Design an enzyme around this catalytic site. Structure first.
Site, mmCIF file in Angstrom:
data_model
loop_
_atom_site.group_PDB
_atom_site.id
_atom_site.type_symbol
_atom_site.label_atom_id
_atom_site.label_comp_id
_atom_site.label_asym_id
_atom_site.label_seq_id
_atom_site.Cartn_x
_atom_site.Cartn_y
_atom_site.Cartn_z
ATOM 1 N N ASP A 35 -3.826 18.860 -19.768
ATOM 2 C CA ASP A 35 -4.812 18.952 -20.840
ATOM 3 C C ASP A 35 -6.176 19.343 -20.299
ATOM 4 O OD1 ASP A 35 -6.289 18.650 -23.116
ATOM 5 O OD2 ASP A 35 -6.270 16.441 -23.097
ATOM 6 N N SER A 199 -16.720 33.578 -26.468
ATOM 7 C CA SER A 199 -15.999 34.791 -26.794
ATOM 8 C C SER A 199 -16.962 35.810 -27.410
ATOM 9 C CB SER A 199 -14.849 34.464 -27.759
ATOM 10 O OG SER A 199 -14.220 35.637 -28.250
#
Length: 330
Positions: A35, A199
């Site tokens: 994770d 992004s």
């Protein structure tokens, strides 16, 4: 040193991925969910409340000659989806794919919430975010990666998640045969303890690319792709009959649909998520309403590039002095 381990979807939807981990001496192998959105290595154990164990493999520290109680240490964590676990702490030898760390904090669960109990395939989590998020008190502990770093040939790990198929986590090297083209690296902020990046935009299907900054986290421990409501609405508007259902808890779509792809930007590069990766199947057995793999982050407080996004790429978690993230197509 290096390590290399195969990671396997837990179910037919790729809801999560498990990776075998050797703990203790002799080895006790548990299948853990790696994770990158948390920083605790915790396991089901001989200390876990019996009614909260349902089929998991447990770590029994009393059977490990290298286990030592970390005196006074406790831990307690709550995840983004509302699940939780807590307990006490041992140090022991932990190996992943041939890479061994001695003195690793292994957090033994005394209590786990219902969605852990009900997930018989997940024996615990192995956190790979920054150690500043580790919950052990009164002395915070380091992640497996943080402990291994100095010994690694290169201070990196890579995630290569499969679509309805196994994949690979590598530590200490970049497998140049595992991706196509080049790897595009992008800046990381560690201020919140996550692999947080920005992004450069998105496209829906064969549509034009929208240049827009989207801050979010690379999170292998989250199933779906959670993005701003504007982006998500633009995606689902291209699927006939798709709608947001408050009763279900997000966007659903007719299971008869063919889903468009979704592209996200990494610098000047582009990662394409095929439409099929966005299908999470019937909301309930036999239903013709299917759950979407792209959902709104509104009310989460952060955008999350979960498995839906990451499995479309070969992803480098570069833990050099100034961390960065790399993405390649594959």
């Amino acid at each position: 040193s290096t390590g290399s381990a195969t990671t396997t979807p837990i179910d037919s939807l790729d809801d999560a991925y498990i990776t075998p981990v050797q703990i203790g001496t002799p080895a006790q192998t548990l299948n853990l969910d790696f994770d990158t959105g948390s920083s605790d290595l915790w396991v089901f154990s001989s200390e876990t409340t019996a009614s909260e164990v349902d089929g998991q493999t447990i770590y029994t520290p009393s059977k490990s000659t290298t286990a030592k109680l970390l005196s006074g240490a406790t831990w307690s964590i709550s995840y983004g989806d509302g699940s939780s676990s807590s307990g006490d702490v041992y140090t022991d030898t932990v190996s992943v794919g041939g890479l061994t760390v001695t003195g690793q904090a292994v957090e033994s669960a005394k209590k786990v919430s219902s969605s852990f109990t009900e997930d018989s395939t997940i024996d615990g989590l192995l956190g790979l975010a920054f150690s500043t998020l580790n919950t052990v008190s009164p002395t915070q502990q380091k992640t497996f990666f943080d402990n291994a770093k100095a010994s690694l040939d290169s201070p990196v790990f890579t995630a290569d998640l499969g679509y309805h198929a196994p994949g690979t986590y590598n530590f200490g090297f970049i497998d140049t045969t595992a991706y196509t083209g080049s790897i595009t690296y992008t800046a990381v902020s560690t201020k919140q303890g996550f692999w947080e990046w920005t992004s450069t935009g998105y496209a829906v299907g064969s549509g034009t690319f929208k240049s827009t900054s989207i801050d979010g986290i690379a999170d292998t421990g989250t199933t779906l792709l959670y993005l701003p409501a504007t982006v998500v609405s633009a995606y689902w508007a291209q699927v006939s009959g798709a709608k947001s259902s408050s009763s279900v808890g997000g966007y659903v779509f007719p299971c008869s649909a063919t889903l468009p792809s979704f592209t996200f930007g990494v610098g000047s590069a582009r990662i394409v998520i095929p439409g099929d990766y966005i299908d999470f199947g019937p909301i309930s057995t036999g239903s013709s309403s299917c759950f979407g793999g792209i959902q709104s982050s509104a009310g989460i407080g952060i955008n999350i590039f979960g498995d839906v996004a990451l499995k479309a790429a070969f992803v480098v978690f570069n833990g050099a002095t100034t961390p960065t993230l790399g993405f390649a197509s594959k």
